[PDB]
A paper describes a structure:
Bioinformatic analysis suggested that DUF3715 resembles a poly ADP-ribose polymerase (PARP) catalytic domain. Despite extensive trials, we could not induce the wild-type DUF3715 to crystallize. Hypothesizing that β6–β7 loop disorder precluded crystallization of the wild-type domain, we purified a variant with the Δ261–269 deletion. Validating our design, crystals were readily grown of native and SeMet-labeled samples, enabling X-ray structure determination of TASOR DUF3715 to a resolution of 2.0 Å by single-wavelength anomalous dispersion (SAD) phasing. In TASOR the key residues required for catalysis are even more degenerated than in ZAP or RCD1: all but one of them are replaced by hydrophobic amino acids. Based on our structure, TASOR therefore lacks the chemical functionality and physical space to bind the NAD+ cofactor. In particular, the loop connecting the final two strands (β8 and β9 in TASOR) spans 14 residues in TASOR (Tyr303–His316), compared to 5 residues in all annotated human PARP family members. In TASOR the extended β8–β9 loop has elevated B-factors in the crystal structure, and broad NMR peaks caused by fast T2 relaxation. We have identified that TASOR activity relies on an extended loop unique among the PARP family, and a single point mutation (Y305A) in this loop is sufficient to abolish transgene repression, endogenous LINE-1 restriction and genome-wide H3K9me3 deposition.
Residue numbers in the entry: 111 to 259, 269 to 329
The structure:
Amino acid sequence: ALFQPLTPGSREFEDVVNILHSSYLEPTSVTNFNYRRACLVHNELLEKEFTEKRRELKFDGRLDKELSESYAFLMVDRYQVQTICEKGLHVGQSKITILGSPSMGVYLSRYADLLQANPLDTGAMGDVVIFKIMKGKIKSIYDPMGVKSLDPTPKHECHVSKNANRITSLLAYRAYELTQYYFYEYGFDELRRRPRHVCPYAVVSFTYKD
């Protein structure tokens, strides 16, 4: 069973909602999102490869700090929750370029209230996939200023924007793109199309009221 529906008000339901509530860029976004349904994702194949990747990272010397699990988010269109939760998140599904080519990595939002470039419209409805991730050893990069962006940095698990903590407002210029995580993984001689240190964990449906 890939999806396990959770009953609203239950412990498991409020745990998933608590991941979202604790991950806002503006914690007062708690008044604007109503999470009306939620499922845990149980994809044994993806969880196997996440667990395998974590033990390889520890084999290659990453610190226990770098082995920690955290969460990141993706708002998903056209009822494609099914494909990402069953197949995993693949390269080429984002149009963001700020941290490297989307053909070489996958982009996830750091903040659960910052899921698209422009503000959400009142009454909007959406589906948000919650991924568990290992940021591992992070490569911090400056946003591009007339220079070609880097290929994914070998021996690091993701790219992040160097000064993203400067971002405090959902309306700051390019807040959405500057608060992304960029996950990638080199195979042997090729970039993997699906980084294994990203794994779908839960799905929620929301309505938005500003």
